[PDB]
Amino acid sequence: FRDNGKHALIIYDDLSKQAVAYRQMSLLLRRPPGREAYPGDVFYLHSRLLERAAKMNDAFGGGSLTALPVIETQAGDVSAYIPTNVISITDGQIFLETELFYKGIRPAINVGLSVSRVGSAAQTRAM
Amino acid sequence: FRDNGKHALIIYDDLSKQAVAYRQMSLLLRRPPGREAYPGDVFYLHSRLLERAAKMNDAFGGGSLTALPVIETQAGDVSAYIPTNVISITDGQIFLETELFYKGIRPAINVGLSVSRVGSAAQTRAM
Amino acid sequence: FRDNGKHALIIYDDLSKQAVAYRQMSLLLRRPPGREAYPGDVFYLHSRLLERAAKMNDAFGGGSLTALPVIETQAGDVSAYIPTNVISITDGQIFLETELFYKGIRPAINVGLSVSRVGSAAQTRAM
Amino acid sequence: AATGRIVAVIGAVVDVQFDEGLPPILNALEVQGRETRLVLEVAQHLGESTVRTIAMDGTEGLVRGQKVLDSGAPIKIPVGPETLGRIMNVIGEPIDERGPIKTKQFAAIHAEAPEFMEMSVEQEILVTGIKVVDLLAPYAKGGKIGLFGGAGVGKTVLIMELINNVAKAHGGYSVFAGVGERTREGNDLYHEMIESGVINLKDATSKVALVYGQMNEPPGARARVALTGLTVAEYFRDQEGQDVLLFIDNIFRFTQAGSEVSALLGRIPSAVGYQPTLATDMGTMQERITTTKKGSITSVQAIYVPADDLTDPAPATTFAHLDATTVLSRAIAELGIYPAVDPLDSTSRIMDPNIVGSEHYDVARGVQKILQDYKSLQDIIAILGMDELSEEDKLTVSRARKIQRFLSQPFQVAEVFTGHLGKLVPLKETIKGFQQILAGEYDHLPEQAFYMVGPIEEAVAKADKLA
Amino acid sequence: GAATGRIVAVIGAVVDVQFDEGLPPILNALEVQGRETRLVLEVAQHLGESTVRTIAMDGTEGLVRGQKVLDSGAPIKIPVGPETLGRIMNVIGEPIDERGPIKTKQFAAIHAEAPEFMEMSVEQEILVTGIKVVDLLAPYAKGGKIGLFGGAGVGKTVLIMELINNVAKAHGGYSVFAGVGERTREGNDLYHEMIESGVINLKDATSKVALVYGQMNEPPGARARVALTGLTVAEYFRDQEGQDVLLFIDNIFRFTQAGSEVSALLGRIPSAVGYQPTLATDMGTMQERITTTKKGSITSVQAIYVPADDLTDPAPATTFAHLDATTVLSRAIAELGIYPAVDPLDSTSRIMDPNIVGSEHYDVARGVQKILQDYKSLQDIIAILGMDELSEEDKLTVSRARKIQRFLSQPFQVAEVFTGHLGKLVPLKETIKGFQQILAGEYDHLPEQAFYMVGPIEEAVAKADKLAEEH
Amino acid sequence: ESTTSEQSARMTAMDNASKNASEMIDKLTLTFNRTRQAVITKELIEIISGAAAL
Ligand SMILES: Nc1ncnc2c1ncn2[C@@H]1O[C@H](COP(=O)(O)OP(=O)(O)O)[C@@H](O)[C@H]1O
Ligand SMILES: [Mg+2]
């Protein structure tokens, strides 16, 4: 849909389970592990997948593909090995807190830590 | 003494040196290691041994065998590998601390961190 | 100098970079790694060095050879592998800190901890 | 299916060199020339007509050259209606020595998951009958449960009360599957089940089918005990169409035994020391418990959390499959309340108004609220005093005392001990009673008359009789 | 000569030899030809096709493949006897002090077996050294086994050279100092600290000590066998002659730790934190030959390095069972100036018993340790409430406990070059009497600076008068 | 007057030293738990790579 001038959208759910199913595929062939026994290339797994969401200019059709990956964290660690391989790829984050969800504010979106590096310059003038 | 209607009592002293004597034998036979370089079958050492202590019945003789195994921890760490096998197998522990030994309480038994799983059925009617 | 009469002095700046040149050089020779992939004889690497720093008797020449090895540590932790192996070869130490440097004590010497086997107390008479 | 000589014995790992009939993986072998059955389950192929297998009894007295056959199928077990009230180990042999299990057809223990177009798409709620479990943390159907709380809490009396409620309104039998359990406590479980009425040694009036793989049995035969207790549990789903239950004790010893098999073969371990295939191995077991179009399997599994670490790799992976939790704590037993269920720390994922409805959500969120502030002002009344709380705080003392005694229930399997008749309450009788205490229609009732009754009409009835 | 093998593979300090005719057993000695120094290799494994795997005892430079290797027919044969006194000796039994050779008529191969169960003397005694923490709280025993723990820089070469002064001069029997891998500087003091003190005499035959020195400038196969050259000279004095011996070893952690330096080069899979998989087996092969049989006695004092002050390390924590008496030096105590650094609540002996030391010695040392564990529960209150909030009974505890803590310190005689004080040597009958009175209350009226660095309690009132006169 | 107010501010300022200590150990249990798990993994890869390098 990108290369024919149409507008697409893809959603992964979730990319932390593709990485525990690639760790298994690389331990069993006896490749050296790393932090949390992850292989040496658990970055290039997710970078070459998320590099493919682009907007093409008007020569190449003008179509777009939007990607929204999903990661799961362990009790709130945003400094683990995998959530700092995707934060340093995507153009923003949408943090959800486990404290705000039990108190009642749902969708428990933390507004102080959710940004958009590029999506500020593209929204409606009415908003 | 169990198959013949008599009774006995055995005291392993201590079971944390059998498990190191097995580990020396495995890793020179090149059996693959695990956590803390113990082989995989080291729960199988202390499970087939500490289940031979039984209380038989009237049609087999009426024997018994009681076992008190001894295990030495290292600075209160009851969450290492061998001290967590043998807590799961047996029917209770008696926990002695060296803080109570110098505050004037000897025998230096902690009452809070000790349990027997059978308990009140294994007592006389006056105690 | 020392084997002909005079007095020398030698600074190794530093000796945490003579260890990672032994870890790499002796992993590509297919030698099995020890702790932190260091070889078996990193203690023998530093010890056969720091024992030539002698003080000869006067029927040989009487010359001396001081030594001042520098060691960089990570996050001010002195209980690492290569620090503790070289604390216990030297007669005394000079513990340089960071909170002394920034509060204002420069040279930032911890005079509380900077112990020294005083060297037959050859300070001088007036000092 | 042919004859293969042995060629290596190392630990609990046997190595069998066939000639023509090379078996597939997960095929059960049988060693010939021995006293009792020694089976071997094929796990790899190595080339040169050699397989490798994990033994399921003691590996002593095996000579290099013994002739071992091939069953031509996996481990086949006696599957029938005449297997209830009996005990068997991982390979179908009876071990209560009551006579052989006389059955017609067998089933292998290794299958695949239900298909994509066999599922059910409307979530339903399996009522049990217990007051706290139906309301504040309801069970799904096909769902998975966690049971927290060790020995000394009122635990085995909860297991047998589940089985004597699933067969009084639903008609589906159960399985017990002790994984690596204690031999000393497998007998006090058997001998309590006899005197309570669920297993009966005389007739065709049993409910449970015990499958005991015990702690002194090798690690290859400790992982496969939850599959043999699942294979039995599907005849009452597939071939009969009922609502099966299944108890695993416990879900950590299933996981710990998989790491022992995987390290005897040679596979390099994962994070903190477990096996690389940790989530798939839990996947292929936990995906066979669903709600197909014929019937369903429900599950109830006890969980052990090592070193108080709720982010440890084994309870992290198990929590990804759960639809509920149940927590048994030491303190609620001291108050005198049975079963010992903590209604603030026991959860359920289907607690949502689209699944349970509108009436059930706005009560289990109301009675969940009235017990939260009482834990807060269990300090103000403990330091400042009693009459110094407000007059609207003399009602959060009443209606957080009248409710947490109506979370108690006289069980039926402990009939002779309490002397009281075991009561059952349906799901609309749980909701009709809890709404009237927050509404305060029964504000004129003493806090002792809310103890060990059935419906709302009994507590009221009980109060009238007193004094 | 027999089985003149040939060298094939020198990888580190692990040489492999190949024999044409006669394979030698495990634990032998091999002699590499064509070198101007004596290099000795000890057999350790048998590999197949007549190749063995040895370990050198010297430097492996200049080892060209295809080099001949002789064989002696036995393990390493050292000199032994009475004429080894006042000497310093190598691992393979050679002189290193340039006095000439050792002329003895008896050799002992260093590999022997532990004496059996029916050769075990059972009796306990007491031993008085002069120190108010040893003799009060962790008393020694005539023939027992004594280990000195603690980290680096806490006082183990001082506490072991003070007991050489106290006990090993007023003793009728003999002594052996085995230096297993330590600083060659510190092995020049004790050679000269005991020439002027009469324990070594360089002209006549009345010396009473023997020295074994292989230090930390030595390859790690020779720092595993000076622990065994020690207790082969220290066993001829117990078994053959019916005498009484003392055994001083510093440091015995370098025996274990130099076995982890050639584990993986031999061909083993390494165990937990990096040690060899034969830790508690090669150790207990050695620590059972240091026993008192019914032919003699041995009183062994061994210094035990604890790496990085970590007592739960596997090299010290498997040594706590080969010992009767433990004196554990801490570092958080020696930072307060208290010397000897000995921890009161962590040292322990077996004979602390109301049937050997008496029921007055026992009631004292179980009230010193009980008031010091009462101190630490107050130190967590002082850090918040401050000192002038406490009650009047708890203030009395802290003052006596700080009086007791300062009174456990004592000026040694070997601190006459470090501190400038004068040395004490307190008898046992005064040690019990002094501590009995501070617990009673008969010195509640003094300043704490009297008690710091004195001997008997009568010197701790002769200081509180000089402080009040110079006020 | 000044003795009651000195006591009831010795109660309220001790509740807030006790609430501020519960938030410092629960943030230090989590750091302890991750640091405990990361040394089991660290020493185990030292053995797995020590066997396979032979
Ligand atoms: N009486 C004493 N008590 C405690 N420490 C002392 C005393 N006299 C000197 N010291 C210092 O304590 C240090 C202890 O080091 P030492 O015992 O020689 O080696 P080790 O590192 O083996 O403990 C010495 O450098 C010395 O400067
Ligand atoms: Mg020293």
Short mmCIF file of N, CA and C and ligand atoms in Angstrom, two decimals, chain E residues 151-153 155-158 182-183 185-186 250-251 303, ligand 2:
data_model
loop_
_atom_site.label_atom_id
_atom_site.label_comp_id
_atom_site.label_asym_id
_atom_site.label_seq_id
_atom_site.Cartn_x
_atom_site.Cartn_y
_atom_site.Cartn_z
N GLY E 151 40.90 -9.33 56.57
CA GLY E 151 41.22 -8.84 55.25
C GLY E 151 42.67 -8.44 55.03
N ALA E 152 42.91 -7.39 54.25
CA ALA E 152 44.27 -6.95 53.96
C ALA E 152 44.57 -5.67 54.72
N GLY E 153 45.65 -5.66 55.49
CA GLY E 153 46.03 -4.50 56.27
C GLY E 153 45.37 -4.37 57.62
N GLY E 155 46.27 -6.48 60.40
CA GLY E 155 47.10 -6.86 61.52
C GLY E 155 47.43 -8.33 61.68
N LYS E 156 47.59 -9.07 60.58
CA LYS E 156 47.85 -10.49 60.65
C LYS E 156 49.32 -10.86 60.65
N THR E 157 50.19 -10.04 60.09
CA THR E 157 51.61 -10.34 60.18
C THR E 157 52.19 -9.83 61.50
N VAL E 158 51.48 -8.92 62.17
CA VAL E 158 51.88 -8.44 63.49
C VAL E 158 51.41 -9.39 64.58
N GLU E 182 54.11 -14.81 50.03
CA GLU E 182 53.86 -13.49 50.61
C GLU E 182 55.01 -12.57 50.20
N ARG E 183 55.06 -11.36 50.76
CA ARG E 183 55.99 -10.34 50.31
C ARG E 183 57.41 -10.69 50.72
N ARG E 185 59.84 -8.76 51.10
CA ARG E 185 60.24 -7.80 52.12
C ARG E 185 59.99 -8.35 53.52
N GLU E 186 58.76 -8.84 53.77
CA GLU E 186 58.37 -9.37 55.07
C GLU E 186 59.07 -10.68 55.41
N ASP E 250 52.05 -18.71 56.85
CA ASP E 250 51.54 -17.42 56.39
C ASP E 250 52.00 -17.28 54.94
N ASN E 251 51.09 -17.38 53.97
CA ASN E 251 49.64 -17.42 54.13
C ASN E 251 49.06 -18.65 53.44
N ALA E 303 47.78 -18.15 59.19
CA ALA E 303 47.13 -16.92 58.75
C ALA E 303 46.30 -17.21 57.52
MG MG G 2 50.78 -9.70 55.82
#
